[PDB]
A paper describes a structure:
We determined cryo-EM reconstructions of the extended and contracted E217 sheath at 3.1 Å resolution (FSC = 0.143). Alkalization or spontaneous contraction during purification, observed for ~20% of all virions at neutral pH, triggers tail contraction. This results in sheath compression, with the pitch decreasing to 265 Å and the outer diameter increasing to 250 Å, while the rise and twist decrease to 22.1 Å and 30°, respectively. A secondary structure superimposition of the E217 sheath protein in the extended versus contracted conformations revealed that the N-terminal arms undergo significant movement, with an 80° rotation around residue 24 upon contraction and a maximum displacement of up to 20 Å. Sheath contraction results in a dramatic quaternary structure reorganization with a ~17° clockwise rotation of the β-sheet and extension of the β-strand #4 that becomes nearly straight C-terminal of Gly14. This results in striking compaction and contraction of the sheath that expands in diameter, exposing ~500 Å of the naked tail tube. Upon contraction, tail sheath bodies come into contact laterally, forming a much tighter lattice that releases a large amount of energy. Because of the increased diameter in the contracted state, sheath subunits do not make direct bonds with the tail tube, whose only point of contact is with the gateway C-terminal extension. Sheath subunits make extensive lateral contacts in the contracted state, providing the energetic contribution that makes this conformation thermodynamically stable.
Residue numbers in the entry:
A (entry chain D): 1 to 25, 27 to 42, 45, 47 to 75, 77 to 96, 98 to 309, 311 to 356, 358 to 431, ...
B (entry chain M): 253 to 309, 311 to 356, 358 to 431, 433 to 434, 436 to 456, 458 to 504
The structure:
């Protein structure tokens, strides 16, 4: 018949459907060989994947217990740092190895390539006492090949997860892959090689920490306050990583753990370098890792009302005491070190003592304002990107400024309720505001807590001669600072 | 090719799932269901089809494709990491979880498609029903009444005829009377009339145009009616979070 569309036509769709994710606020860069270099991986899950002995479970157990005074982090991430030279690898997330490789006793063929094909002879696994035997038998058949990578290649099997891993003989350079063949007796599906998403790792050099963190942030950057947490790093490595962190203005935090004596050696290298935190350890004691306190406090925050919080007065019963003298605390505070201090209050004796970061005059010294600026930048960027993705076009006229301001309004409304905008008493700041903004009486407004402007100018980009427009906005707001000292006098009569 | 007419259910193994979702990415109206290897057939691709077929569009019929139990079908995934890997490929399955000793239900009601298309299956079904009902009412109007004049009486009569369908849509649950600024700006831009977003309090906004044109087949001028409908889709809660502060 003639289709009905000749007479009635209806088109269905979803408007403003473009979803833009929301930024989350810890990531650990370990060195163990379980994690492939090119990936980034909600406590029991960590226990299952890594095992009870690993330091990763040790960290996650203490990380996942936290109350934040407003009743938890609820996520963690791991990435891989290539400490030393590595051989090419091929690495199986699906549950397998139910001891049902039977039926592959009929002359199995598998194909692997360094740069040209290598076919493997008949592999029979009918006996298959265990998957360890299966890996050994695969290794025996692979080692018969005359290619230098495959001459001493190793095949291993992991029980905690369900991964088969193949490692080439040579160290430093090489590329390996596995191909899906058309033969019936091909075990690239019983193995998880060449199916779905398989990580093929090429050979690498010794590599460097600041390059490793950049590679990790390339794949996903939904985190805050990363840390390495392996063996202690050299001072130069800490300097390089702190410089790299300072390269991005107000994105991440970087927590370091030091001894008391080493603290003075630092704060000379890492002076400036906004976004770096130093935490003092206790020598000749349990590990009771402490560099995670700012990271935990940041992770637990939910940006609900009254969420500004304060990093100073907070208690950590797990961590052990660090300093107990006033003169020692005075010496430590010169280096901007964060610690757990103990003080007597009518018999009872311990809390985190300083919430300060190393940085310049222009950067945020306190950690609470640092976190709030991270959240503001992420929220504004999300709203603007979502606007760009949904609406058809944004005209460069008065309607454009009106629409942009209307869209940014809810974020600024929520910012007042959160506590990042304080509606607070200087003359110097008044003059600075009147100079930076041509409009006077902006400082009186910043009564309400903020002042916003939109520009919408035009320009020509360098890449193409064409004129492309652009929007420039300026935001001023009063930061959220908490009282830290109380003084008074009680006059009687 | 047809926008929002049919659904297409496919059954795959776990390993083959990653191979797909590269070919069939986009392609609105396609559903992927994971099978169990080395087990009974216990065909599973029929779950969305059965749920759609049983619906009767009576009050409270919007329903939700997520939380529903299939005792006939066998379990598919049982680890959180495996479920995390599977969800990246938009696969639908039966998951098992412990709730104080007792152990199984369909887990995701998502379809593969683009940003403009309906990812959830419930809104997909409701849009199918809306299109069919509107087309039926308009065709019936054309077939019964003698003529539809291209004047104010025309818009009034067309709106009056479409009114009962939209009345039933509110009772069904396909119209929700729901909280964004971006959506507000989009609505104010798409429709020249501002304060439409405040109206969409009631759940919908409808317009009629009645313009004229000349068709290509014959030189003659033939008229036509253009209508625009905006309504708030029906979305169901899927996650619960809270904090219990004591003292």
């Amino acid at each position: 018949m003639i289709s009905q569309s000749r007479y009635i036509r209806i088109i269905s769709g979803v408007g403003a459907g473009a979803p833009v994710a929301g930024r989350k606020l810890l990531r650990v860069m370990t060195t163990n060989n379980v994690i492939p270099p090119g990936i980034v991986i909600d406590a029991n899950a960590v226990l299952s994947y890594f095992g009870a002995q690993s330091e990763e479970y040790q960290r996650a157990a203490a990380y996942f217990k936290f109350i934040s005074k407003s009743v938890s982090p609820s996520s963690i991430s791991f990435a891989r740092w290539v400490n030393t030279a590595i051989a090419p690898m091929v690495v199986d997330n699906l549950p397998k190895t139910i001891a049902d490789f039977a039926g592959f006793s009929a002359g199995v063929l598998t194909i692997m390539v360094g740069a040209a094909e290598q076919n493997i002879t008949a592999i029979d696994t009918s006996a298959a006492t265990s998957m360890d035997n299966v890996a050994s038998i695969i290794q025996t058949e692979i080692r018969k090949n005359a290619d230098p990578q495959l001459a001493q290649a190793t095949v291993t099997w992991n029980q905690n997860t369900n991964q088969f891993t193949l490692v080439g003989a040579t160290i430093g350079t090489g590329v390996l892959a596995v191909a899906k063949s058309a033969d019936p007796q091909d075990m690239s599906t019983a193995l998880g090689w060449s199916t779905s998403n398989v990580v093929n790792v090429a050979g690498q050099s010794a590599d460097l920490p600041d390059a490793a963190v950049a590679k990790s942030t390339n794949v996903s950057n939904n985190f805050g306050s990363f840390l390495f947490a392996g063996a202690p790093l050299d001072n130069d490595q800490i300097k390089a990583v702190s410089a790299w962190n300072a390269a991005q203005n107000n994105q991440f935090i970087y927590t370091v753990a030091t001894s008391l004596a080493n603290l003075g050696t630092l704060f000379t290298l890492v002076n400036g370098n906004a976004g770096t935190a130093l935490n003092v350890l206790s020598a000749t004691a349990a590990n009771d890792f402490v560099e995670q306190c700012p990271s935990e406090i940041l992770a637990a925050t939910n940006y609900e009302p009254g969420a500004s919080q304060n990093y100073m007065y907070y208690q950590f019963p797990g961590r052990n005491i660090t300093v107990s003298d006033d003169t020692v605390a005075n010496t430590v505070d010169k280096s901007r070190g964060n610690y757990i201090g103990v003080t007597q209050a009518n018999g009872q004796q311990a809390f985190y003592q300083r919430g300060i970061l190393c940085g310049g005059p222009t950067d945020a010294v306190d950690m609470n304002v640092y976190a709030n600026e991270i959240w503001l930048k992420s929220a504004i960027a999300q709203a603007l990107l979502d606007l760009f993705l949904n609406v058809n076009a944004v005209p460069a006229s008065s309607t454009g400024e009106a629409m942009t301001l209307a869209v940014l309004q809810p974020v600024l409304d929520k910012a007042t309720a959160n506590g990042t905008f304080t509606y607070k008493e200087s003359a110097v700041q008044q003059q600075y505001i009147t100079q930076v903004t041509g409009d006077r009486r902006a400082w009186r407004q910043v009564t309400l807590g903020y002042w916003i402007n939109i520009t919408f100018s035009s320009y020509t980009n360098s890449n193409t001669g064409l004129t492309e427009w652009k929007a420039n906005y300026t935001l001023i707001y009063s930061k959220g600072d908490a009282i830290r000292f109380v003084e008074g006098s009680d006059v009687m009569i």
